[PDB]
Design an enzyme around this catalytic site. Structure first.
Site, PDB file in Angstrom:
ATOM      1  N   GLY B  15      53.564 -11.237  -6.332  1.00  0.00           N
ATOM      2  CA  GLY B  15      54.274 -12.194  -5.500  1.00  0.00           C
ATOM      3  C   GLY B  15      54.561 -13.557  -6.105  1.00  0.00           C
ATOM      4  O   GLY B  15      54.986 -14.469  -5.395  1.00  0.00           O
ATOM      5  N   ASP B  37      59.249 -14.051 -17.641  1.00  0.00           N
ATOM      6  CA  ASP B  37      60.475 -13.309 -17.382  1.00  0.00           C
ATOM      7  C   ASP B  37      61.696 -14.052 -17.887  1.00  0.00           C
ATOM      8  O   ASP B  37      62.556 -13.463 -18.542  1.00  0.00           O
ATOM      9  CB  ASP B  37      60.649 -13.026 -15.890  1.00  0.00           C
ATOM     10  CG  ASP B  37      59.750 -11.912 -15.398  1.00  0.00           C
ATOM     11  OD1 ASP B  37      59.587 -10.925 -16.135  1.00  0.00           O
ATOM     12  OD2 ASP B  37      59.217 -12.010 -14.271  1.00  0.00           O
TER      13      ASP B  37
HETATM   14  C1  LIG Z   1      60.469  -8.302 -17.454  1.00  0.00           C
HETATM   15  C2  LIG Z   1      59.284  -7.603 -16.647  1.00  0.00           C
HETATM   16  O1  LIG Z   1      59.532  -6.633 -15.954  1.00  0.00           O
HETATM   17  N1  LIG Z   1      58.101  -8.227 -16.869  1.00  0.00           N
HETATM   18  C3  LIG Z   1      56.826  -7.827 -16.272  1.00  0.00           C
HETATM   19  C4  LIG Z   1      56.240  -9.063 -15.564  1.00  0.00           C
HETATM   20  O2  LIG Z   1      57.273  -9.581 -14.653  1.00  0.00           O
HETATM   21  C5  LIG Z   1      55.845  -7.154 -17.317  1.00  0.00           C
HETATM   22  O3  LIG Z   1      54.719  -6.727 -16.560  1.00  0.00           O
HETATM   23  C6  LIG Z   1      55.299  -8.154 -18.365  1.00  0.00           C
HETATM   24  C7  LIG Z   1      53.970  -8.671 -18.361  1.00  0.00           C
HETATM   25  C8  LIG Z   1      53.550  -9.573 -19.360  1.00  0.00           C
HETATM   26  C9  LIG Z   1      54.515  -9.959 -20.390  1.00  0.00           C
HETATM   27  N2  LIG Z   1      53.947 -10.916 -21.387  1.00  0.00           N
HETATM   28  O4  LIG Z   1      53.076 -11.700 -20.986  1.00  0.00           O
HETATM   29  O5  LIG Z   1      54.352 -10.881 -22.511  1.00  0.00           O
HETATM   30  C10 LIG Z   1      55.807  -9.484 -20.441  1.00  0.00           C
HETATM   31  C11 LIG Z   1      56.232  -8.584 -19.447  1.00  0.00           C
END
Ligand SMILES: CC(=O)N[C@H](CO)[C@H](O)c1ccc([N+](=O)[O-])cc1
Ligand SMILES: CC(=O)N[C@H](CO)[C@H](O)c1ccc([N+](=O)[O-])cc1
Ligand SMILES: CC(=O)N[C@H](CO)[C@H](O)c1ccc([N+](=O)[O-])cc1
Ligand SMILES: CC(=O)N[C@H](CO)[C@H](O)c1ccc([N+](=O)[O-])cc1
EC number: 2.7.1.-
Lengths: 178, 178, 178, 178
Positions: B15, B37
């Site tokens: 969330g 993201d």
């Molecule tokens: C683009 C997407 O779907 N990302 C999700 C999180 O929102 C994925 O779990 C994620 C978690 C950690 C991350 N990171 O910290 O490098 C990159 C992507």
């Protein structure tokens, strides 16, 4: 007997979209999902700036004109046709005309097996979710939260105020006859 | 004393995004929001197909390589710079390295006033929401739901399992020093 | 005589979507737009991971299974129904089966007044645009650029290689009987 | 000598976004892309309804207030910081203040190696593309097509009126010192 079409009705941000995506994942047979939003999408952008089109008052209101209804209808006849063509159809709508809206549907549906679902949610909660979303114009949630259901008869009701989507989905899926 | 940067940490579908949009609406002064993201977004598409980049295993996994971290770092120094430049910065991240991830941040943050926020959510609930969403690859939610918090120290924790976003937002806003 | 349905056919990135949005703005009467993409949207996400569904090979390929066709058909009968219901319908598709694809349509269309439009574009140019887009999996453009038209008979052809969308739109609109 | 930051300037629909995605694919080293649009994204939604924020006149206009500039600045200092941190940064902007806008950048850039790129496009063509897009409010294209460049000095100019993005990208990449 076999459920050929599921019609969801609920104000904005009541959680309809999520339920749909969940139902699709849950239900074994492929269900196609269409809705007022996807209709807006299919309609020319100007329909939103036209007279008998549709306009979103900055206060969160929404008014539909004859031009919009005109299309909206043939569209309805179309979705019904897909069902009769054998496609399982899910439709999440927003009965602005409450009971009136459901009758409109009924005339298109005919004797087609339809599962009427109502998606309720505390106006305030919805409004709050409306903010977290960022997608809609602040106001719609609170405005539709109740009126839309006013006079509508359902086969299943779900309140997303304290129930997750996947859950509401499960409750709904349980009424779908294969 | 004045809170210059809010850092949210929580698994996918916990969330976070919603809380951010809510906090932005709530907080009186404009807060800029950035995140892992939005970083992925800023990174070249190939970074997702590169070696030291980032890859999303079909089982819902996620692995970060040195190429990705390399960028990720300069990016971090950048957001911190915006804060020191006077911009209020909100950052929702996903500490895959748990405690390790928080240290990394700490080194960039320096002596900058930061409000560490943890966004928790029942893995199952999250997974369920992950479905209603349709946005992410089934699996990530359950996978990050807990590990991410493992060892991380927060200033405020919020569990979106039974609390709305707008609510969690309010709890967080209450710790932001003007 | 009156044109009741416009069917666009062209490989990915040939510029179909843009033409559609342009045609909608141009044409005086409201035209609803639907397509293979919007169908994918209406189909459950799993349809993309199912057997008789649809899969996007990483090399840019695309293969359709019976499960997908099954739905695809009832959907077609549905759009045709909307037209006969009086709604003006625009449909941009991708005849992977070339001529075969057009016949399939013909059977659903019946004696309905249809304007067959072909949207061509230099494979290389398309491929290049495919990159600038970021939306599709590198490969599809070059792969469909030609095969799709192979054997298909149109009423109007447009090549977006050196012609803007608004332009191609104008050329098309000129063949639409009111 | 080594090019540390590429700054693109051009009116809406001149093709900037596409060039960026292309440059990213082309250039061997990973380049992060940020822009006025991504800034709007990072800014609270209300910034668009605030006074010193930013407002999009229905005629396609755009006016920036001090509140917006305030943030906009710290943001700029931030992107520059990422560059100095070693990240290669691409930035597509829209110099509404023409020359004035470029000076603003210059002060933040400092002695940082920057490649100034101008992205031009026939106003009419742009306007036409603006329609095919559906994304922006009819009017912006024609309005910015020229003023934005007025007085700005570039290191490379590209006109997407008759040149594909991938092409313009190539011309630009050719001036990037490794
Ligand atoms: C683009 C997407 O779907 N990302 C999700 C999180 O929102 C994925 O779990 C994620 C978690 C950690 C991350 N990171 O910290 O490098 C990159 C992507
Ligand atoms: C596109 C959008 O934001 N639509 C929301 C519902 O999702 C709006 O409240 C609405 C409600 C009813 C409607 N209708 O039934 O015509 C059209 C839009
Ligand atoms: C969603 C997507 O990227 N679709 C592109 C076309 O836009 C793909 O080439 C495609 C082509 C044909 C198709 N089909 O006809 O079944 C389905 C997808
Ligand atoms: C979000 C959007 O539609 N932005 C377009 C450009 O893409 C608009 O013309 C614009 C131009 C300049 C600007 N600015 O420089 O502040 C902000 C928005």
């Amino acid at each position: 007997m076999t459920t050929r079409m599921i019609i969801l009705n609920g104000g904005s941000s009541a959680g309809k979209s999520g339920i749909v995506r969940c139902l699709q994942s849950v239900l074994p047979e492929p269900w196609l999902a269409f809705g007022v939003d996807s209709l807006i999408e299919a309609m020319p952008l100007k329909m939103q700036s036209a007279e008998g089109g549709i306009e979103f008052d900055a206060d969160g209101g929404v008014s539909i004109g004859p031009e919009f209804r005109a299309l909206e209808g043939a569209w309805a006849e179309g979705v019904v046709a897909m069902a009769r063509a054998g496609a399982r159809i899910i439709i999440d709508d927003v009965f602005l005309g409450g009971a009136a809206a459901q009758e409109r549907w009924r005339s298109f549906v005919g004797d087609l097996d339809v599962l009427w679902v109502g998606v309720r949610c505390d106006g305030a909660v919805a409004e709050g979710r409306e903010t977290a979303r960022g997608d809609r114009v602040a106001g719609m949630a609170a405005k539709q939260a109740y009126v839309v259901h006013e006079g509508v008869e359902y086969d299943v009701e779900v309140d997303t105020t304290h129930k997750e989507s996947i859950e509401c989905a499960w409750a709904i899926a349980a009424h779908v006859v294969p």
